[PDB]
Amino acid sequence: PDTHRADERRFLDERGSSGPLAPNGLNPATIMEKAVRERIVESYFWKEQCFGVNEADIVDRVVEHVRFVGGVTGVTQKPSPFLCLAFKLLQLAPGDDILKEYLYFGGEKFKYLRALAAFYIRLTRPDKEVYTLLEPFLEDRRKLRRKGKNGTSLTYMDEFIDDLLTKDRVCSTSLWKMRRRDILEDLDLLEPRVSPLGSLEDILEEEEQAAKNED
Amino acid sequence: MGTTDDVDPEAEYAAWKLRELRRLRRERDAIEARERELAELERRRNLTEEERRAEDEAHLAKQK
């Protein structure tokens, strides 16, 4: 009595023939590399915690099980629960409402949920939309753990977002190549990014004022 | 390991401020680089026929 295994097997073994595409025009099943897909579906966490899960279950699993951001680590090539849940999100293909909830409301309560949502958005969304959605969270300064060679190292949400926005490979996953932000700006699709701090000149003026006055 | 937020709000905000400043400086550097590119473009545009010929020949013979 297990339709779940059948559905998963169907998704993994072939897609795009009977697969709805991501908003960026990619096929969700092939967004992550085949090798990594193998490492995930074979993994214990996938088999015991991702089996037949739901979008609600996604939040529950994130709170319960993810303690860091990472791809595949160690000699055994174990995929992080974070990565596995990302792959599951690729499977579930959640809509804008669910992503909105995860990111803003869930993200406010659970930082790793925001990290997951941001990752998924970078994976599945058009470049302009990705910049517009993710750039505000450069103001999110909450601490995150990232999986290193032994244990974990410290990073921050704004650093993770910046990585998503500026790097080709994140969490053992190749991110679809994007038009650079300056290209979008040149094409008038995007205005230049506005920092919460303001312009560099403004920062210089405030700095000079703070220095001149006694402090 | 594990992470705990807001153990020292002031310090954490200061650190974030430096990170954001770093991003801002990166953006500024990019802008200046682009302006240098436009400057060189314009410079090429204003070369005479013979000047451009001499320049391109010099570059080619140099790469040779």
Side-chain angles (χ1 to χ4, degrees), chain A residues 84-133:
Chain A
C84 295
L85 287 178
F87 185 70
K88 184 47 100 160
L89 272 182
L90 287 176
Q91 200 184 334
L92 298 186
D96 282 22
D97 31 340
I98 305 292
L99 291 182
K100 201 179 294 200
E101 178 197 327
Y102 287 164
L103 199 68
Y104 298 113
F105 191 84
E108 219 67 73
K109 296 194 276 156
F110 315 111
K111 49 197 191 170
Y112 286 106
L113 183 52
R114 174 164 308 175
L116 184 49
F119 187 37
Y120 183 80
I121 287 184
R122 172 70 179 76
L123 293 179
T124 65
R125 251 64 184 177
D127 47 12
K128 165 180 172 185
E129 210 188 329
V130 166
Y131 286 114
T132 57
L133 293 165

Side-chain angles (χ1 to χ4, degrees), chain A residues 99-100 102-104 113-141 156-167 170 175-176 178 181 190 193-194 196, chain B residues 16 20 23:
Chain A
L99 291 182
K100 201 179 294 200
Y102 287 164
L103 199 68
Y104 298 113
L113 183 52
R114 174 164 308 175
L116 184 49
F119 187 37
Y120 183 80
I121 287 184
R122 172 70 179 76
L123 293 179
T124 65
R125 251 64 184 177
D127 47 12
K128 165 180 172 185
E129 210 188 329
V130 166
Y131 286 114
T132 57
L133 293 165
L134 299 192
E135 281 187 343
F137 301 114
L138 289 177
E139 206 176 350
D140 192 342
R141 77 177 100 112
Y156 307 86
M157 177 67 60
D158 54 299
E159 265 192 353
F160 186 65
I161 297 301
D162 194 42
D163 280 357
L164 293 173
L165 298 183
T166 71
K167 266 170 165 97
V170 167
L175 325 173
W176 64 284
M178 284 185 173
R181 218 215 182 260
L190 280 187
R193 185 183 74 92
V194 284
Chain B
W16 169 84
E20 177 71 7
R23 287 185 288 263

Side-chain angles (χ1 to χ4, degrees), chain B:
Chain B
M1 295 191 46
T3 35
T4 302
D5 294 313
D6 291 319
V7 211
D8 191 334
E10 208 174 354
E12 290 163 15
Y13 180 80
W16 169 84
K17 191 159 173 289
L18 286 191
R19 298 197 301 271
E20 177 71 7
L21 276 178
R22 191 141 162 256
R23 287 185 288 263
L24 285 176
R25 178 54 144 76
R26 191 185 58 200
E27 291 170 343
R28 171 67 84 241
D29 284 3
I31 290 182
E32 291 174 349
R34 198 222 319 278
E35 276 163 358
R36 283 196 308 275
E37 293 177 353
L38 247 70
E40 168 73 358
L41 206 76
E42 172 83 357
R43 191 198 65 85
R44 287 282 294 181
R45 298 248 309 172
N46 290 332
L47 296 181
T48 68
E49 193 67 33
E50 206 203 300
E51 278 172 351
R52 180 178 62 169
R53 204 169 196 266
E55 243 197 43
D56 294 339
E57 287 292 345
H59 176 279
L60 182 136
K62 178 192 177 185
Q63 91 175 12
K64 237 201 182 74

Side-chain angles (χ1 to χ4, degrees), chain A residues 56-71:
Chain A
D57 290 331
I58 284 300
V59 174
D60 293 312
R61 293 308 132 96
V62 167
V63 169
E64 203 170 345
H65 294 296
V66 353
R67 295 305 181 251
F68 57 87
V69 299

